[PDB]
């Protein structure tokens with residue numbers, strides 16, 4: 001794979017495909033990218049930071065199981081009595097399988113950064129005129145093991161989320177689609193923006209995707225990393241219509257079920273794209289890119 | 296009426312689960328400044344690694360975590376069955392039942408401590424050089440202990456400096472970090488004491504391990520009174536592991552003996568909460584020396 | 593119209609779901625499904 | 631009893647012999663003798679087996695397991 005040569009400078013094996021320790025070099029660029037993204041934040045945007053886990057009931061309510069049940073990581077634990085736990089530990093001691101004593105907690109590993117913001121917004125009552133904007137980030141998890149450096153199981157996501165009338169969200173997404181392309185250009189990256197679909201699970205899912213692409217509810221900024229024929233989506237621009245507004249009873253300034261949308265930056269994919277494009281020697285990066293990143 | 300509870304309004308938002316909170320911009324700005332201050336004290340030659348919130352289950356099992364804190368471990372499970380089985384699980388959910396019966400464990404756990412993944416990484420490099428190795432590691436950690444107290448989270452940030460070498464390399468390292476960490480706490484204007492302590496091992500035999508740990512003075516904590524001076528909150532720890540990880544991972548020091556290890560751990564969320572409890576949630580009203588040390592201006 | 597794009601008339605995702613379902617009710621159709629043929 | 635005492639010193643001396651040797655006196659602290667954690671675990675079991683009793687978890691403490699003296703004071707109180 002074309003990205004493989006980057007591994008030695010960027011990552012250390014943690015004994016599991018798609019789960020890597022990050023070197024100081026790699027993390028310094030993730031951090032500069034995060035700061036660059038922050039510097040483009042629209043005024044009036046509330047910044048929240050989420051932990052890597054969230055409420056299972058909240059995610060269930062958001063409908064994640066109808067779309068990507070195969071990707072979800074659930075948190076489980078030994079919730080039994082001391083006797084039960086002791087037997088589990090005893091099985092392990094003998095080289096047996098202690099994991100049969102696991103049961104699910106009330107938490108999952110977050111599959112996207114924006115999910116927890118919808119109930120938070122809803123608890124504040126009706127939206128002001130012009131809607132609400134959030135800046136959120138989380139370490140996310142998706143159960144898709146791969147050896148490719150651009151397909152991780154645990155990865156950082158940063159999102160700007162808009163909640164408001166259809167016009168609010170639509171204007172928001174157009175601003176960000178232009179703005180994201182300008183950022184990518186300033187970073188010296190090669191890309192195109194195209195219609196896309198989320199990878200819905202199963203038969204019905206395949207038709208959800210067609211309909212998603214047809215309605216143009218999702219654009220991606222695609223960067224050629226392993227090939228020009230199969231580029232890597234490093235950002236997405238998502239329009240959810242009234243799905244979350246209805247789900248969470250959020251109503252806009254006009255008494256209608258709010259529309260929502262988000263712009264998502266895959267922080268590890270952008271960093272990997274930067275190293276693939278510019279190499280692992282920062283002093284050699286183009287001067288305009290170094291300046292843009294404050295290097 | 297916990298004395299910390301009033302801090303929630305400015306610092307956190309509920310995420311529908313005790314010990315799991317969204318962090319406000321105010322809160323995160325201080326965690327980040329605390330992180331930068333700790334970084335400014337990093338010793339030259341210390342290798343910085345950043346770990347994700349999950350790690351290899353096999354690695355964690357091998358390190359002995361189950362025999363110590365089986366009850367705190369969070370495992371990753373998923374729907375690993377066929378498409379038919381997964382669709383059925385979701386349909387049971389749709390019909391008021393429990394989809395989670397179709398879950399099976401993955402090969403990953405949520406990391407209970409930042410340092411665990413560093414030992415196999417060190418081991419893979421062969422014999423330690425003289426003087427040993429030093430690491431700066433960080434991770435979002437998870438411990439299954441729900442609580443409504445803002446100083447006891449289920450998901451929290453840990454920053455550690457880790458030493459791997461001879462017993463002398465490690466005790467020298469721990470000695471110097473105990474002094475420096477106290478200086479940092481002092482610079483932060485925090486009220487604290489440092490005392491020997493033990494890890495909450497599990498079960499009756501676990502009690503004896505704890506007794507021995509306290510007797511051998513393998514663990515110090517920097518304790519800050521948040522709710523009371525009677526039950527203070529451990530915001531840093533200074534841990535000596537003896538040869539446990541060295542033998543487990545086959546790490547040999549420069550004399551060919553099984554390496555000793557130790558770490559100084561900073562609880563980033565606890566330190567931040569300590570700061571807001573101590574100095575209040577108005578940053579402009581913080582002491583000038585504290586604002587200076589944190590580069591708040 | 594039998595030329596009008598399916599999504600233009602107002603058939604969103606759940607509509608298209610039942611549309612794949614409805615076309616099953618007619619014949620041997622078990623449809624996998626691609627963007628072009630819709 | 632001098633029985634409990636000399637017997638405790640034996641199991642302490644037996645576990646000690648699994649690595650090296652030293653001088654074991656009643657007021658000497660077990661940790662100073664050289665007992666590690668698995669030693670203290672093994673010693674607690676070698677005592678619970680020797681005297682046909684179970685130590686209440688409430689009594690598994692540094693106070694009672696400080697020295698041979700403090701230990702016999704615990705064994706004998708049962």
Ligand SMILES: Nc1ncnc2c1ncn2[C@@H]1O[C@H](COP(=O)(O)OP(=O)(O)OP(=O)(O)O)[C@@H](O)[C@H]1O
Pocket residue numbers: 112142144150151152153155157197198199232233234235236264265266267268269
């Ligand atoms: N497995 C992954 N590894 C790394 N980054 C990822 C991964 N999945 C998603 N991201 C990043 O998160 C962003 C937002 O998430 P989104 O759900 O839009 O991804 P996606 O549409 O599933 O993609 P793909 O077809 O690339 O798997 C993506 O644009 C990408 O940059």
Ligand SMILES: Nc1ncnc2c1ncn2[C@@H]1O[C@H](COP(=O)(O)OP(=O)(O)OP(=O)(O)O)[C@@H](O)[C@H]1O
Pocket residue numbers: 408438440446447448449451453493494495528529530531532560561562563564565566
């Ligand atoms: N539940 C938690 N919430 C927040 N921070 C925590 C939590 N557990 C540990 N930490 C922080 O991270 C460090 C972890 O090292 P350590 O394993 O020594 O914790 P601990 O000994 O379990 O603590 P405690 O007695 O408070 O449960 C602690 O010093 C503390 O600052």
Ligand SMILES: [Mg+2]
Pocket residue numbers: 142
């Ligand atoms: Mg994906």
Ligand SMILES: [Mg+2]
Pocket residue numbers: 495
């Ligand atoms: Mg604990």
Ligand SMILES: [Zn+2]
Pocket residue numbers: 112113114115159238262263264
């Ligand atoms: Zn989103």
Ligand SMILES: [Zn+2]
Pocket residue numbers: 408409410411455534558559560
């Ligand atoms: Zn540690």
